């Protein structure tokens, strides 16, 4: 038995053309401190994480759970936008399994961490000649914190075995330490704006993703070009049947 085989071929589900407001959580002027890192569960729009080559010095680009080539094709659920400003030396210890002064007392990652971190130089932008003593971190605490936890309390650390309350002095030290950032500091000491993502493909149904592809319109041809979409072949013609606004298929 004979049969005709289709030429240009696809299937029709993708129809999107949605706006996606970004580059303000990524290119802001005011950013959070080390311990003041805030969470934005991004579920707004497509959020294309692949078009980020406008800024050249994106030295931290490695990602573990997913590859950047196959990043904006699958669907994530409840991605977290966490941003903080640290030094360039602390960028290498953001990865799980590392140790340091920031990986035990300020902010630590789980061993099963999903996502990756993006960092870039911000010394000219974030360093004044008189110093910027507004980004500060904590070094002293009673015990090591859990991952994904914030500490706000500025109580005086009781390093020694002497009773002191409020007033500092001997063996009573201030935990919060302000950074000494200068534009003349070398690589690793400059203020570096740091953004980290946590996709966390669990629990809720997936909300944030978008392919956003498009195709053409060629009426009455034995092809399948269909906005890069859901399975199904045939030919495409013009039909005069009427749908209600919430109708999709037939």
């Amino acid at each position: 038995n004979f049969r005709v085989q289709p030429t240009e071929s696809i299937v029709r589900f993708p129809n999107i053309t949605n706006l996606c407001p970004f580059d303000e959580v990524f290119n802001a002027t005011r950013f959070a401190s080390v311990y003041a890192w805030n969470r934005k569960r991004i579920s707004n729009c497509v959020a294309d994480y692949s078009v980020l080559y406008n800024l050249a010095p994106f030295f931290t680009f490695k990602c573990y759970g997913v590859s950047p080539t196959k990043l904006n094709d699958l669907c994530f659920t409840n991605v977290y936008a966490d941003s903080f400003v640290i030094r360039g030396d602390e960028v290498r210890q953001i990865a799980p399994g590392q140790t340091g002064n920031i990986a035990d007392y300020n902010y630590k990652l789980p061993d099963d961490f999903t996502g990756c971190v993006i960092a870039w130089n911000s010394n000219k932008l974030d360093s004044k000649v008189s110093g910027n003593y507004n980004y500060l971190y904590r070094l002293f605490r009673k015990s090591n914190l859990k991952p994904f936890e914030r500490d706000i309390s500025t109580e005086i650390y009781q390093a020694g075995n002497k009773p002191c309350n409020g007033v500092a002095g001997f063996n009573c030290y201030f935990p919060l330490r302000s950074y000494s950032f200068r534009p003349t500091y070398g690589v690793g000491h400059q203020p570096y704006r740091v953004v980290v993502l946590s996709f966390e493909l669990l629990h809720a149904p997936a909300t944030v993703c978008g392919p956003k592809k498009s195709t053409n319109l060629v009426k009455n041809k034995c092809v399948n070009f269909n906005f890069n979409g859901l399975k199904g072949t045939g030919v495409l013609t013009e039909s005069n049947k009427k749908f209600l606004p919430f109708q999709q298929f037939g």
Partner: antibody
Amino acid sequence: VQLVQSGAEVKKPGASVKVSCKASGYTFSSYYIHWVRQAPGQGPEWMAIINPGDGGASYAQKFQGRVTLTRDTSTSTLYMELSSLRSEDTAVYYCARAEGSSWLGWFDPWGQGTLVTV
Amino acid sequence: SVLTQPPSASGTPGQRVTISCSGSSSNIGSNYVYWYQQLPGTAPKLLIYRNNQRPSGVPDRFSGSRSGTSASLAISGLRSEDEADYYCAAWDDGLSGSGWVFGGGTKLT
């Protein structure tokens, strides 16, 4: 709209020198000042940045601690002080205006400079 | 880095002469480049802006542009007043110190 300098003479080795250059024209309190020195047989190197008012300066690695920097608005004299003067530091110091509250940018025309020798 | 420059640029009046400043990584590729002219007996002046325009006024015969990790300046119509020397300036952003490392030193005849 021009920058004038001071004078200097031969100084003893291992001492401290002080240079103040008066500035007239543009706003004194909203313009950074770059301090450089020019030596014969070599080019000029940046060595101090002046933020007027609080005098917050970010010196280089080779110019940290050895340079004392003072900025004001009433007397409008930019005080620079250098310690441990040797025969290598005999040069003409220049103070120049900058963009103002921003390091990166072009350079304003320089003054006549003050020659210091040891 | 070091920003090496040729010690001299031999030439004749009426002939175009090109001077080249050799930079390094993260100095010419991203940081803007400045060409400065040092005059004998007077204060140094802003010879040129970023490599598109003139500071206050000059004929367009003074050409300057960057390429790769280096910079170049072509000067034609040499006169007696044009007999001077030039320097190259670029932001450093180097390790342990981010001042202003200038170029080397040339000589125009």
